[PDB]
């Protein structure tokens, strides 16, 4: 029954440091700079996850700066932060104390995949819609997450509430200022990142979200491979060889390379026959070579695949209310305010 106290700064609101006490620590995962712990805050009994990141003594940490600015129901909340020692001798670590969420979209997907069963489509709609809302929100600040994948989609399995996490790659993108191409994880990388582009946009997150959607509909990742060349072969087998015009929209240094010559596979044959046609249609507007031809997150939210979510009588299969879906702010709608007519139905 050990109680630990530390002085920490709240993640939002007052900059005043406070004493915070926690107990019941236990290891739950592994981070790039140290183990990840669960703990229970003494004042409230709420569970948190504490993760460590290396403090750069010359630049303030981008993930902290981003997570202090965000406040959205589909983004994991930063409760507190503080500094400590850690795994490497002589180093200072930033500790981010996050609201704990016990499951992920990846766990649910693997659960159904291993059972050889299709994830019910109502859950596919709920998860993807919430993911697109979180993207609309961060993209409205200019922030690109750069590492969208199912393991970074936290899930409360009972309430179906999804929260995007892991902003350790996120960056405010600025047109004309280059960015590293080596972000985003295997299976989920947009083709212009596979091609090494340094001038990409937030539409890389929309490609990754289309990969998540396809994976939930297929029961396995749609573009697997351990090397970019294997991944690209899977992409070309579906989308067909990219044209020179398309390659120039991704990375013009690649226009003249020799690529496998394959005709596009029909989108209706990519998925199993009973896949709902609106889900296929949505996927085809997300997994597009040309980055500017991909839907924006708000446009994806307004897509007819999500119309069931806007029906007054929709419930979860377990009889519960749907989670919050229509509490858009001005900030979140700012890329295109009058999608609100679709987005906020009359009963909301």
């Amino acid at each position: 029954s050990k109680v630990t106290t530390v002085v920490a700064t709240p993640g939002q609101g007052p900059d005043r440091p406070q004493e915070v006490s926690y107990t019941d620590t236990k290891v739950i995962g592994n981070g790039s700079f140290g183990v990840v712990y669960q703990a229970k805050l003494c004042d409230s009994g709420e569970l948190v996850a504490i993760k460590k990141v290396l403090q750069d003594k010359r630049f303030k940490n981008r993930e902290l700066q981003i997570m202090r600015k965000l406040d959205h129901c589909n983004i994991v909340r930063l409760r507190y932060f503080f500094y400590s020692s850690g795994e490497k001798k002589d180093e200072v670590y930033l500790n981010l104390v996050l609201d704990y969420v016990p499951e992920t979209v990846y766990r649910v997907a693997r659960h159904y995949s291993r059972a050889k069963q299709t994830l019910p489509v109502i859950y596919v709609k709920l998860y993807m819609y919430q993911l697109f809302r979180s993207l609309a929100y961060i993209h409205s600040f200019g922030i690109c997450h750069r590492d969208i994948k199912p393991q970074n989609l936290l899930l409360d399995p009972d309430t179906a509430v999804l929260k995007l996490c892991d902003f350790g790659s996120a960056k405010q993108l600025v047109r004309g200022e280059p960015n590293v191409s080596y972000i985003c994880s295997r299976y989920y990388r947009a083709p212009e990142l596979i091609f090494g582009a340094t001038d990409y946009t937030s539409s890389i997150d929309v490609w990754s979200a289309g990969c998540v959607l396809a994976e939930l509909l297929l029961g396995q990742p749609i573009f697997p491979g351990d090397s970019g060349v294997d991944q690209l072969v899977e992409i070309i087998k579906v989308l067909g060889t990219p044209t020179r015009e398309q390659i120039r929209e991704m990375n013009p240094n690649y226009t003249e390379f020799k690529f496998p010559q394959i005709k596009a596979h029909p989108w209706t044959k990519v998925f199993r026959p009973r896949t709902p046609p609106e889900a296929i249609a949505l996927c085809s507007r997300l997994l597009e070579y040309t980055p500017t031809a991909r839907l924006t997150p708000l446009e994806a939210c307004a897509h007819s695949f999500f119309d069931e979510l806007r029906d007054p009588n929709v419930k979860l299969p377990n009889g519960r209310d749907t989670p919050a879906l229509f509490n858009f702010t001005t900030q979140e709608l700012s890329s295109n305010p009058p999608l609100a007519t679709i987005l906020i139905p009359p009963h909301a």
Binding site: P102, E103, Y106, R107, H111, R114
Partner: peptide, 13 residues
């Protein structure tokens, strides 16, 4: 697979 957490109510793999 490659999981975020050590444990899950959905099983192990």
């Amino acid at each position: 697979x490659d999981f975020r957490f050590f444990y899950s109510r959905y099983g192990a793999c």
